[PDB]
Design a protein around this ligand. Structure first.
Ligand code: GSH
Ligand code: GSH
Lengths: 231, 221
């Protein structure tokens, strides 16, 4: 009924974000939404009550998961999957202002940003999710499963660490270093919500991945990011 | 290293590698494939890790673009349809409408983040884990069937609309896109984890059959 009422009379402009109070992927969208200056309203779906089952929500996101975004200005267009939401946001911002904030007007750069974005959504987040699952929520304890996924997460963080280290090495020839085109992009921001969750699986970023540490801290100090995470 | 064309790094049994070959074929781009033997650990060679810092396949080199390196199947697919549309003005396997593109990307990220990884884990605990654990296998097999349930339902609704009947149905804009092709290589392997598409998901069966009959797809595979 709660969510049902919302779809009774939807806003005419702005954005509505469906998420969950402890969903890193939700904050990933909130962050980009905030950085781009997009005004939005967040609805925290109560999965316990099965609000994600509400025919109204499944219609927004057939996968029945969060986040899902409704672009009211575009006839209530619904975009699901955090990766697709980010691309929708930077593409829209760019065509509206002519300024590719957190993005790039260059095909070559966009493909590099996409590579990191797909790497994050497909190789980073899913793995952190599996490690958390076997470490805390599986029907039985499986040490071999925990080790498999925890190792993979450290491995992917090593890929990020190495890339950041190489970017620094190139400049030297504490200054902020970024993954693509020496500028902050959604490729960097996408990791932020999760870099804060990996401690739960025994990973200490500050000590284990120095470069990732500086990188994440630079982003955590940005107003738009602080505002989004406080939401 | 060529001046034009594309060089695709993949593996003989890598569904993600074939996903790229398929799109490269359909779009008419000329490419040559370099198969890596994870035996010798060719994917751990400095020169390859320079192409893909993740040391995984696929990885694509766009020679015409100063040997630009692109890794992650999803990013590779977006690069190809973007480049093709820019060159021809025809959004083959894509769309020139912002709304449509967001839907294509939705399904694309869904396939790469919730489909391929889950099938991958089902296969691992089923065939290659150091220990045999049914609950691990069930967890992923159940998730894969749930994912197909989402596709099946989407295709059924699209079918329902067409009715208001032997015609192909697609995920976005009543036309074949990278959203559809992205599933092809993986649909062909789920039988290894006990999923019978023909029986369990009728619409997916037809959908994958229409795709599997395309000449460009046959050639690539
Ligand atoms: N690949 C998806 C992940 C979607 C996802 O797993 N969302 C989580 C929250 S971080 C969720 O909805 N969890 C509730 C559930 O799985 O029941 C994306 O990036 O949007
Ligand atoms: N999310 C990546 C998946 C990359 C991946 O895991 N590729 C497999 C082949 S399908 C691979 O390189 N396997 C070798 C290994 O894991 O050592 C993509 O879509 O390209």
């Amino acid at each position: 009924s709660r969510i049902t009422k919302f779809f009774q009379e939807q806003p005419l402009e702005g954005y509505t974000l469906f998420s969950h109070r402890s969903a890193p992927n939700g904050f990933k969208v909130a962050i980009v939404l905030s950085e781009l200056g997009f005004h939005y309203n967040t609805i925290f779906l109560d999965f316990n009550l099965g609000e994600h089952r509400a025919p109204e929500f499944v219609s927004v996101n057939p996968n029945a998961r969060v986040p899902a975004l409704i672009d009211h200005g575009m006839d209530n267009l619904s975009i699901w999957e955090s990766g697709a939401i980010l691309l929708h946001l930077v593409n829209k911002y760019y065509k509206e202002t002519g300024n590719p904030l957190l993005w790039s007007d260059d095909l070559a750069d966009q493909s590099q940003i996409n590579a990191w974005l797909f790497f994050q959504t497909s190789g980073h987040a899913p793995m952190i999710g599996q490690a958390l699952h076997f470490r805390y929520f599986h029907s039985q304890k499986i040490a071999s499963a925990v080790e498999r996924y925890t190792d993979e997460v450290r491995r992917v963080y090593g890929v990020v660490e190495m890339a950041l280290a190489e970017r620094r090495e190139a400049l030297v020839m504490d200054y902020p270093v970024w993954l693509v085109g020496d500028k902050l992009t959604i490729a960097d921001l996408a990791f932020v919500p999760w870099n804060n969750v990996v401690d739960r699986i025994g990973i200490n970023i500050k000590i284990e991945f120095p470069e990732v540490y500086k990188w994440t801290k630079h982003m955590m100090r940005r107003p738009a990011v602080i505002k989004a995470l406080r939401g």
